[PDB]
Amino acid sequence: PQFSLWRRPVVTAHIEGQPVEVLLDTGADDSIVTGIELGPHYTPKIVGGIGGFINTKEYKNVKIEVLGKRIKGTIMTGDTPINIFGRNLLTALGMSLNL
Amino acid sequence: PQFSLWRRPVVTAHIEGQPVEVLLDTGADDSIVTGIELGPHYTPKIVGGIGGFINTKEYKNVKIEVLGKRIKGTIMTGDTPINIFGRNLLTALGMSLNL
Ligand SMILES: COC(=O)[C@@H](NC(=O)[C@@H](NC(=O)CC[C@H](O)[C@H](Cc1ccccc1)NC(=O)[C@H](C)NC(=O)[C@H](C)N)C(C)C)C(C)C
């Protein structure tokens, strides 16, 4: 898998069985997703960026299958315009930015 | 170079001579920076981010020297909390996201 980046690096991930489209973001410290409900045990958290900050619901031990791999990881749920797979999951997949 | 992503892929860039700390961002289609002076021949653009939109001044063909390569591209000036070098400049550098 190599993303040349001429187009957004989006891929399909299965987060606890749900297919979700996701952007591979090296500029994101965390992974935020909308549209999937992961349940009642989470930690309110806040994440910020261009535009401001949003409130998120942080989940642990989330089962995700992306690019042919199955990893367990932390996902945040919240008011996001696009689903993001941040650096915490990209390191878990062994993905790297190269020049 | 290879940037594994255990820490933020922040690098040093010179935008028309001016140095600035920049985040190489695959989740950014555009490059937005702040604290750099540019040529008042800009066109107002709007840029969306996590939780919001900010007012931007768009400059075309700005000369940039980053990661030892000289490049040219559109950079947006705005009150961004993080200086971002998006895909328009990453592709120009020849960067790739790899698994
Ligand atoms: C916990 O600490 C934090 O929250 C840290 N924040 C971060 O790490 C945040 N990183 C970030 O906020 C880094 C920026 C992200 O990569 C977003 C992703 C995005 C794309 C499209 C639409 C919406 C959002 N890109 C953008 O905002 C770019 C400028 N937008 C665009 O390219 C538009 C869509 N053309 C994440 C929370 C998303 C910190 C740097 C403040």
XYZ file of N, CA and C and ligand atoms in Angstrom:
635
model
N 0.851 -1.190 0.000
C 0.000 0.000 0.000
C 0.880 1.231 0.000
N 0.741 2.121 -0.990
C 1.520 3.354 -1.103
C 0.495 4.402 -1.519
N 0.469 5.534 -0.858
C -0.444 6.604 -1.153
C 0.511 7.698 -1.621
N 0.333 8.049 -2.899
C 1.114 9.057 -3.603
C 0.783 10.510 -3.234
N -0.399 10.523 -2.597
C -1.054 11.688 -2.075
C -1.604 12.655 -3.099
N -1.763 12.302 -4.385
C -2.329 13.215 -5.381
C -3.823 13.269 -5.094
N -4.356 12.352 -4.334
C -5.738 12.320 -3.974
C -5.668 12.054 -2.451
N -6.745 12.382 -1.715
C -6.800 12.150 -0.267
C -6.579 10.676 -0.023
N -5.730 10.235 0.897
C -5.561 8.838 1.250
C -6.746 8.296 2.019
N -7.851 7.957 1.384
C -9.003 7.449 2.107
C -9.036 5.952 1.945
N -9.473 5.158 2.899
C -9.494 3.687 2.768
C -10.722 3.188 3.538
N -11.148 1.928 3.424
C -12.302 1.388 4.156
C -11.811 0.574 5.333
N -12.311 0.972 6.467
C -11.956 0.297 7.673
C -13.250 -0.307 8.208
N -13.159 -1.398 8.968
C -14.300 -2.054 9.590
C -13.992 -1.758 11.042
N -14.815 -0.977 11.740
C -14.622 -0.612 13.149
C -15.763 -1.348 13.808
N -15.375 -2.403 14.513
C -16.306 -3.268 15.241
C -17.408 -3.801 14.337
N -16.981 -4.128 13.116
C -17.908 -4.694 12.146
C -18.549 -3.717 11.196
N -18.544 -2.418 11.476
C -19.158 -1.450 10.597
C -18.128 -1.044 9.569
N -18.362 -1.068 8.249
C -17.506 -0.398 7.284
C -17.586 1.107 7.456
N -16.460 1.798 7.382
C -16.399 3.237 7.513
C -15.305 3.712 6.566
N -15.472 4.863 5.875
C -14.446 5.391 4.966
C -13.510 6.173 5.857
N -12.218 6.131 5.752
C -11.384 6.873 6.685
C -10.193 7.613 6.096
N -9.857 8.832 6.474
C -8.712 9.482 5.907
C -7.484 9.152 6.749
N -6.366 8.785 6.120
C -5.142 8.480 6.837
C -4.492 9.840 7.026
N -4.521 10.300 8.252
C -3.976 11.585 8.547
C -2.730 11.688 9.407
N -1.570 12.056 8.861
C -0.342 12.200 9.620
C -0.336 13.440 10.500
N -1.260 14.355 10.233
C -1.377 15.575 10.983
C -2.323 15.378 12.139
N -2.905 14.204 12.365
C -3.820 13.989 13.448
C -3.214 13.188 14.582
N -3.256 13.670 15.818
C -2.709 12.900 16.928
C -3.653 11.789 17.293
N -4.954 12.014 17.138
C -5.920 10.992 17.495
C -6.756 10.576 16.297
N -7.650 9.614 16.475
C -8.511 9.120 15.419
C -9.922 9.490 15.819
N -10.657 10.288 15.055
C -12.021 10.701 15.397
C -12.912 10.150 14.298
N -14.061 9.636 14.674
C -15.018 9.037 13.785
C -16.437 9.523 14.124
N -17.340 9.572 13.137
C -18.701 9.983 13.421
C -19.523 8.895 12.808
N -20.705 8.731 13.337
C -21.668 7.898 12.669
C -21.702 6.494 13.186
N -20.891 6.093 14.148
C -20.878 4.710 14.623
C -21.072 4.847 16.120
N -21.871 4.058 16.845
C -21.947 4.330 18.265
C -21.200 3.164 18.872
N -20.205 3.558 19.659
C -19.402 2.559 20.295
C -19.837 2.156 21.684
N -20.818 2.809 22.293
C -21.372 2.288 23.539
C -21.216 3.260 24.698
N -21.556 2.895 25.942
C -21.514 3.754 27.145
C -20.197 3.986 27.905
N -19.129 3.252 27.716
C -17.926 3.494 28.486
C -16.875 4.198 27.655
N -16.706 5.430 28.046
C -15.771 6.281 27.364
C -15.350 7.408 28.313
N -14.450 8.221 27.817
C -13.972 9.341 28.551
C -14.317 10.498 27.607
N -15.055 11.502 28.063
C -15.122 12.791 27.422
C -13.705 13.310 27.290
N -13.424 13.867 26.149
C -12.116 14.394 25.853
C -12.416 15.566 24.947
N -11.415 16.352 24.635
C -11.571 17.516 23.764
C -10.444 17.461 22.751
N -10.611 17.742 21.465
C -9.477 17.741 20.521
C -9.665 19.027 19.732
N -8.599 19.658 19.299
C -8.731 20.922 18.609
C -7.980 20.943 17.296
N -8.143 21.988 16.501
C -7.477 22.133 15.225
C -7.851 23.472 14.618
N -7.873 23.549 13.293
C -8.258 24.733 12.511
C -9.708 24.897 12.875
N -10.198 26.061 13.253
C -11.632 26.116 13.472
C -11.936 26.065 14.944
N -11.327 25.204 15.747
C -11.514 25.288 17.187
C -11.354 23.925 17.782
N -12.137 23.627 18.797
C -12.035 22.335 19.435
C -13.411 21.683 19.420
N -13.518 20.369 19.589
C -14.819 19.703 19.621
C -14.711 18.771 20.797
N -15.851 18.297 21.266
C -15.912 17.377 22.400
C -15.933 15.995 21.824
N -15.233 15.042 22.380
C -15.232 13.713 21.831
C -15.457 12.701 22.933
N -15.830 11.522 22.497
C -16.059 10.408 23.375
C -14.950 9.435 22.955
N -14.032 9.177 23.884
C -12.892 8.286 23.720
C -13.129 6.842 24.188
N -12.847 5.952 23.272
C -12.994 4.534 23.477
C -11.672 3.807 23.316
N -11.573 2.780 24.140
C -10.398 1.967 24.148
C -10.756 0.561 23.751
N -9.719 -0.121 23.308
C -9.837 -1.508 22.924
C -10.811 -1.750 21.814
N -10.820 -0.815 20.869
C -11.714 -0.887 19.731
C -11.094 -1.718 18.650
N -11.885 -2.685 18.265
C -11.536 -3.615 17.234
C -11.644 -3.042 15.840
N -10.561 -2.927 15.104
C -10.597 -2.399 13.752
C -9.805 -3.254 12.770
N -10.322 -3.432 11.566
C -9.671 -4.208 10.494
C -9.497 -3.140 9.408
N -8.289 -2.826 8.955
C -7.992 -1.812 7.941
C -6.877 -2.458 7.112
N -6.702 -2.073 5.824
C -5.629 -2.595 4.987
C -5.212 -4.063 5.191
N -6.128 -5.014 5.330
C -5.729 -6.394 5.554
C -5.209 -6.692 6.958
N -5.140 -5.744 7.895
C -4.710 -5.989 9.261
C -5.812 -5.818 10.309
N -5.727 -6.519 11.438
C -6.715 -6.400 12.518
C -5.910 -5.814 13.664
N -6.289 -4.681 14.238
C -5.571 -4.073 15.347
C -6.612 -3.664 16.375
N -6.296 -3.441 17.633
C -7.257 -3.030 18.647
C -6.729 -1.626 18.896
N -7.514 -0.591 19.173
C -6.905 0.718 19.353
C -7.856 1.721 19.922
N -7.436 2.952 19.991
C -8.268 3.948 20.579
C -8.932 4.753 19.481
N -10.237 4.947 19.595
C -10.975 5.699 18.615
C -11.811 6.650 19.441
N -12.012 7.811 18.824
C -12.785 8.866 19.371
C -13.959 9.018 18.430
N -15.068 9.346 19.018
C -16.318 9.555 18.365
C -16.604 11.035 18.544
N -17.153 11.735 17.554
C -17.502 13.111 17.799
C -17.848 13.749 16.501
N -18.458 14.890 16.688
C -18.883 15.872 15.692
C -17.766 16.098 14.632
N -17.355 15.163 13.737
C -16.291 15.414 12.788
C -16.824 15.357 11.365
N -16.473 16.352 10.515
C -16.813 16.400 9.084
C -16.296 15.253 8.231
N -15.219 14.570 8.680
C -14.606 13.456 7.983
C -14.054 12.449 8.996
N -13.979 11.122 8.753
C -13.455 10.183 9.760
C -11.960 10.168 9.564
N -11.234 10.297 10.664
C -9.793 10.348 10.670
C -9.104 9.244 11.422
N -8.053 8.707 10.857
C -7.263 7.673 11.459
C -5.951 8.435 11.571
N -5.677 8.805 12.825
C -4.518 9.560 13.218
C -3.302 8.701 13.475
N -2.245 9.337 13.946
C -0.941 8.757 14.151
C -0.907 7.567 15.092
N -1.814 7.575 16.074
C -1.862 6.446 16.998
C -2.216 5.127 16.260
N -3.072 5.130 15.243
C -3.409 3.910 14.544
C -2.427 3.727 13.412
N -1.885 4.782 12.784
C -0.944 4.618 11.683
C 0.335 4.005 12.249
N 0.718 4.264 13.515
C 1.925 3.627 14.026
C 1.578 2.139 14.257
N 0.406 1.832 14.811
C -0.029 0.473 15.046
C -0.002 -0.303 13.720
N -0.270 0.289 12.551
C -0.219 -0.412 11.252
C 1.216 -0.436 10.662
N 2.184 0.242 11.250
C 3.531 0.336 10.732
C 3.550 1.175 9.466
N 2.813 2.284 9.404
C 2.748 3.075 8.203
C 3.789 4.157 8.382
N 4.409 4.696 7.354
C 5.392 5.746 7.512
C 5.271 6.741 6.347
N 5.763 7.948 6.551
C 5.719 8.955 5.543
C 7.133 8.822 5.021
N 7.341 8.908 3.733
C 8.655 8.775 3.164
C 8.823 9.789 2.038
N 10.102 10.149 1.862
C 10.619 11.077 0.870
C 11.846 10.379 0.279
N 14.147 11.084 3.420
C 13.865 10.700 4.809
C 12.556 9.940 4.976
N 12.466 9.219 6.099
C 11.325 8.399 6.485
C 10.909 9.006 7.795
N 9.625 9.187 8.035
C 9.092 9.762 9.266
C 8.221 8.625 9.718
N 8.606 7.911 10.774
C 7.734 6.834 11.252
C 6.692 7.698 12.019
N 5.603 7.310 12.673
C 4.864 8.446 13.218
C 4.698 8.445 14.705
N 5.776 8.070 15.392
C 5.728 8.013 16.836
C 5.689 9.422 17.403
N 6.127 10.416 16.660
C 6.084 11.785 17.128
C 5.531 12.577 15.907
N 5.053 13.806 16.042
C 4.530 14.603 14.951
C 5.552 14.851 13.844
N 5.265 14.678 12.558
C 6.265 14.881 11.527
C 6.354 16.382 11.262
N 7.081 17.066 12.143
C 7.302 18.481 12.070
C 8.682 18.643 11.465
N 8.794 19.614 10.580
C 10.004 19.912 9.859
C 10.078 21.415 9.750
N 11.277 21.867 9.401
C 11.602 23.271 9.224
C 11.533 23.656 7.743
N 10.869 24.761 7.428
C 10.742 25.202 6.050
C 11.068 26.671 5.930
N 11.444 27.117 4.745
C 11.747 28.535 4.528
C 10.764 28.859 3.430
N 9.850 29.795 3.717
C 8.798 30.265 2.807
C 9.255 31.670 2.480
N 9.794 31.841 1.265
C 10.297 33.119 0.785
C 11.314 33.701 1.765
N 12.215 32.783 2.131
C 13.305 33.113 3.020
C 12.988 32.928 4.480
N 11.718 33.120 4.844
C 11.209 33.083 6.222
C 11.122 31.702 6.850
N 11.740 31.353 7.979
C 11.638 30.030 8.582
C 10.389 29.873 9.422
N 9.870 28.637 9.373
C 8.665 28.245 10.093
C 8.638 26.722 10.298
N 8.180 26.339 11.486
C 8.026 24.944 11.944
C 6.769 24.478 11.185
N 6.764 23.361 10.484
C 5.607 22.926 9.727
C 5.317 21.443 9.912
N 4.045 21.079 9.951
C 3.604 19.725 10.119
C 3.289 19.121 8.758
N 3.885 17.993 8.348
C 3.587 17.389 7.054
C 2.293 16.629 7.338
N 1.272 17.141 6.654
C -0.061 16.630 6.789
C -0.863 15.990 5.647
N -0.965 14.648 5.676
C -1.702 13.930 4.652
C -3.200 14.139 4.763
N -3.731 14.604 5.893
C -5.136 14.918 5.994
C -5.467 16.376 5.619
N -4.531 17.073 5.005
C -4.765 18.428 4.610
C -4.550 18.502 3.122
N -5.560 19.042 2.462
C -5.531 19.216 1.043
C -4.779 20.479 0.743
N -4.798 21.471 1.624
C -4.175 22.791 1.524
C -3.087 22.999 2.553
N -2.228 24.001 2.346
C -1.141 24.340 3.252
C -1.489 25.644 3.953
N -1.512 25.772 5.279
C -1.887 27.023 5.944
C -0.812 27.233 6.943
N -0.389 28.458 6.953
C 0.668 28.815 7.836
C 0.366 30.152 8.482
N 1.163 30.587 9.460
C 0.934 31.867 10.078
C 2.271 32.387 10.572
N 2.289 33.713 10.720
C 3.463 34.467 11.134
C 4.527 34.659 10.046
N 4.173 34.741 8.756
C 5.124 34.844 7.637
C 4.601 36.024 6.805
N 5.352 36.971 6.224
C 4.753 38.058 5.447
C 4.722 37.676 3.982
N 3.650 38.000 3.251
C 3.599 37.651 1.848
C 3.091 38.761 0.876
N 3.032 38.435 -0.407
C 2.936 39.535 -1.335
C 1.544 40.073 -1.562
N 0.847 41.104 -0.849
C -0.606 41.467 -0.725
C -1.534 41.317 -1.911
N -1.100 40.465 -2.769
C -1.713 40.123 -3.979
C -2.050 38.674 -3.577
N -3.153 38.604 -2.840
C -3.684 37.353 -2.325
C -5.172 37.289 -2.653
N -5.834 36.151 -2.606
C -7.232 36.138 -2.894
C -7.781 35.460 -1.662
N -8.835 36.045 -1.108
C -9.540 35.572 0.101
C -10.116 34.200 -0.180
N -9.886 33.226 0.682
C -10.408 31.882 0.471
C -10.889 31.453 1.836
N -11.648 30.378 1.967
C -12.119 29.975 3.286
C -11.536 28.589 3.522
N -11.020 28.188 4.686
C -10.496 26.827 4.812
C -11.172 26.121 5.990
N -11.760 24.973 5.692
C -12.391 24.101 6.688
C -11.425 23.133 7.366
N -11.636 22.951 8.669
C -10.828 22.094 9.526
C -11.709 21.343 10.531
N -11.069 20.752 11.553
C -11.786 20.042 12.606
C -12.535 21.119 13.383
N -13.824 20.849 13.348
C -14.683 21.812 13.987
C -14.607 23.261 13.465
N -14.579 23.586 12.160
C -14.792 24.964 11.774
C -14.066 25.391 10.526
N -14.234 26.652 10.196
C -13.745 27.227 8.965
C -13.024 28.469 9.364
N -11.946 28.884 8.705
C -11.235 30.095 9.042
C -11.040 30.895 7.747
N -10.834 32.193 7.948
C -10.616 33.088 6.804
C -9.155 32.994 6.453
N -8.913 32.846 5.176
C -7.579 32.693 4.655
C -7.234 33.651 3.538
N -5.954 33.910 3.342
C -5.454 34.780 2.302
C -4.664 33.760 1.483
N -4.989 33.515 0.222
C -4.323 32.563 -0.654
C -3.280 33.212 -1.553
N -2.047 32.712 -1.560
C -0.956 33.234 -2.370
C -0.584 32.087 -3.283
N -0.438 32.399 -4.558
C -0.116 31.377 -5.526
C 1.391 31.374 -5.774
N 1.943 30.266 -6.254
C 3.358 30.147 -6.567
C 4.411 30.590 -5.574
N 4.193 30.430 -4.264
C 5.157 30.828 -3.258
C 6.334 29.852 -3.295
N 7.517 30.404 -3.220
C 8.704 29.606 -3.268
C 9.025 29.143 -1.878
N 9.187 27.824 -1.753
C 9.494 27.141 -0.498
C 10.739 26.245 -0.513
N 11.540 26.187 0.532
C 12.714 25.320 0.557
C 12.438 24.479 1.807
N 12.209 23.191 1.587
C 11.924 22.289 2.672
C 12.505 20.909 2.411
N 13.028 20.249 3.449
C 13.619 18.907 3.354
C 14.682 18.781 2.258
N 15.434 19.904 2.193
C 16.516 20.079 1.215
C 16.103 20.281 -0.260
N 14.801 20.382 -0.582
C 14.282 20.520 -1.944
C 13.681 21.915 -2.088
N 13.756 22.520 -3.275
C 13.192 23.841 -3.502
C 11.934 23.489 -4.233
N 10.824 24.079 -3.830
C 9.497 23.841 -4.380
C 8.665 25.152 -4.557
N 7.507 25.160 -5.210
C 6.686 26.352 -5.404
C 5.268 25.881 -5.168
N 4.419 26.704 -4.560
C 3.062 26.271 -4.354
C 2.178 27.285 -3.673
N 0.899 26.921 -3.678
C -0.078 27.738 -3.013
C -0.078 27.580 -1.504
N 0.207 28.625 -0.738
C 0.146 28.490 0.704
C -0.932 29.575 1.079
N -1.726 29.246 2.125
C -2.812 30.065 2.679
C -2.295 30.596 3.997
N -2.544 31.850 4.256
C -2.142 32.493 5.479
C -3.437 32.553 6.268
N -3.403 32.317 7.575
C -4.570 32.316 8.440
C -4.139 32.061 9.890
N -5.050 32.286 10.826
C -4.760 32.061 12.253
C -5.043 30.585 12.519
N -4.046 29.816 12.137
C -4.108 28.386 12.307
C -3.331 28.075 13.610
N -3.791 27.162 14.483
C -3.037 26.727 15.661
C -1.819 25.908 15.309
N -1.712 25.317 14.114
C -0.572 24.509 13.708
C -0.285 24.893 12.253
N 0.984 25.024 11.898
C 1.375 25.375 10.565
C 1.350 24.069 9.842
N 0.549 24.036 8.788
C 0.346 22.864 7.976
C 0.808 22.857 6.540
N 1.506 21.802 6.118
C 1.951 21.670 4.745
C 1.129 20.487 4.287
N 0.104 20.769 3.483
C -0.793 19.769 2.978
C -0.284 19.104 1.691
N -1.161 18.264 1.138
C -0.885 17.449 -0.026
C -0.393 18.210 -1.229
N -0.795 19.460 -1.442
C -0.316 20.174 -2.599
C 1.199 20.303 -2.520
N 1.771 20.462 -1.340
C 3.197 20.578 -1.269
C 3.830 19.217 -1.056
N 3.171 18.283 -0.405
C 3.741 16.967 -0.183
C 3.954 16.265 -1.523
N 2.992 16.310 -2.446
C 3.115 15.679 -3.769
C 4.306 16.316 -4.513
N 4.430 17.639 -4.427
C 5.493 18.389 -5.048
C 6.857 17.939 -4.500
N 6.915 17.474 -3.254
C 8.147 17.003 -2.651
C 8.387 15.588 -3.102
N 7.390 14.844 -3.528
C 7.602 13.463 -3.890
C 7.376 12.553 -2.676
N 6.559 12.983 -1.701
C 6.306 12.205 -0.504
C 5.214 11.189 -0.697
N 5.321 10.141 0.081
C 4.364 9.094 -0.034
C 4.120 8.558 1.351
N 2.922 8.008 1.536
C 2.473 7.418 2.780
C 2.613 5.953 2.433
N 3.387 5.212 3.198
C 3.578 3.835 2.879
C 3.356 2.861 3.954
N 2.827 1.725 3.534
C 2.570 0.594 4.386
C 3.378 -0.487 3.649
C -5.185 16.579 21.526
O -4.471 17.616 20.822
C -4.997 17.881 19.537
O -6.231 17.854 19.470
C -4.085 18.125 18.317
N -4.966 18.196 17.159
C -4.849 17.388 16.128
O -3.970 16.522 16.081
C -5.871 17.581 15.037
N -5.058 17.717 13.867
C -5.354 18.679 13.005
O -6.316 19.443 13.174
C -4.471 18.842 11.776
C -5.319 19.202 10.601
C -6.084 18.014 10.120
O -5.154 17.269 9.345
C -7.356 18.311 9.313
C -8.112 17.047 8.952
C -9.426 17.370 8.277
C -9.561 17.171 6.913
C -10.745 17.444 6.275
C -11.793 17.922 7.022
C -11.660 18.120 8.388
C -10.475 17.846 9.030
N -7.024 18.998 8.068
C -7.244 20.296 7.929
O -7.742 20.916 8.869
C -6.873 20.970 6.608
C -6.161 22.280 6.835
N -8.083 21.262 5.902
C -8.165 21.092 4.626
O -7.199 20.681 3.971
C -9.480 21.439 3.948
C -10.454 20.302 4.194
N -9.238 21.637 2.524
C -6.832 16.355 15.078
C -7.699 16.484 16.324
C -7.788 16.305 13.893
C -3.278 19.429 18.502
C -2.382 19.618 17.293
C -4.207 20.596 18.758
